[PDB]
Amino acid sequence: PLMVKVLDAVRGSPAINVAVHVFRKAADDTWEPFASGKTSESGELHGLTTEEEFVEGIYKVEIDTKSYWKALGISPFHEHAEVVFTANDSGPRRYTIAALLSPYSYSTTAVITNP
Amino acid sequence: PLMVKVLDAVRGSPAINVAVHVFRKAADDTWEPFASGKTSESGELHGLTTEEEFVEGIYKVEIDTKSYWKALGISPFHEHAEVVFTANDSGPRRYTIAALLSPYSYSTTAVITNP
Amino acid sequence: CPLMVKVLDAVRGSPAINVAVHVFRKAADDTWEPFASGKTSESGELHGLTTEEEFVEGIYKVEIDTKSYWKALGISPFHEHAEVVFTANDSGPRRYTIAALLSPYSYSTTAVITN
Amino acid sequence: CPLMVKVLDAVRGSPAINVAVHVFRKAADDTWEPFASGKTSESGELHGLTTEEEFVEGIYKVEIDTKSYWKALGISPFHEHAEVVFTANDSGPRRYTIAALLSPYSYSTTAVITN
């Protein structure tokens, strides 16, 4: 129910080995760690959560763009790319969070389907 | 060897039924029709060409964004989104041309892999 | 003068007017301390946030209230807000423009840093 | 005054300086007639392309010479050029800014139309 896809605009390739941390807002308004993982050779990160566990809430998907670029030897601008959204508030949906990275810019979009 | 993927930034969905025309620059410098098709329910267009037919050359992938938005009843800014590039000049590659559409904006990127 | 925020609307092809923007500075304890705020003008710009003396090196977060923007236009948006988190570095150029391009299910951001 | 082009560099976080830009008007026979051209300034902007009297309704193409830009910086780019093709419509607002954000394998463009 939650997938992350990351592309590299400098290389024209998937962004491989990008760390991604997902948080969910708790009742006390703090960000609780929810799931994390790394993008594969295809730039995709599957297996973050399950439909049972991915309940309604406000989620933050933090894509660790600085760590990605630094591991490539590049000094980038941003610390991370964040995507913050309410999920599953009209029932379960499947969400793909996609991002396109450059050293001084990024883009993100959501692809949401109803099973 | 050539796939096109189109996403809709207003709907948060694949862009379905987007017409795409591919041209290849001829020896006389005109744009020759090369292949065409429509995106599926997943926003993807497969089957445009073959590795035999997709020789070296300068290609133009024209994504018919105005026709897409007009079919949704929206008056958009652009006539189309174009992506013009040299392909297969260091041997065969597989190209994905991706685009993200809004009524007054679009983004495009390339994902290129070597089989 | 050292920091400007510019916000554009990809749906209407216009500046994003009267958008609330909050800037925070990361404190030593990793919390986000309020730093400056305002609303974008008719040109989508927010000037006068800080001065050279106040804008020291460090990590800053620019939060753009995209949800209220879209709702005021009668549009249901995906994101709670847009975030741009970056490091200010004195060894680079001296004026930072943080630009954002908004759609309901997507946003893009870039840095335009000049002397 | 009715038409301005602004070009930004997503790799360096800067304006895209000294980029050649050619504007064409679609003729009655569907060919592209030269209309105006220039090179972007230190701010990434190209002003003075046309006047109100000259800029009539019709379809225009703005070609940005991204390939030369990247090569002058020592970077191998994907695209031959970037294109932005749109209709000028008198029933909408009166000043058009065509903005482009460049990366080696990707570009984004938006319209900022104001009165």
Ligand SMILES: O=C(O)c1ccc2nc(-c3cc(Cl)cc(Cl)c3)oc2c1
């Ligand atoms: O090849 C695929 O399956 C695949 C999937 C998701 C994708 N998301 C994009 C995408 C995202 C942004 Cl934010 C801007 C642009 Cl231009 C493109 O391209 C994708 C390609």
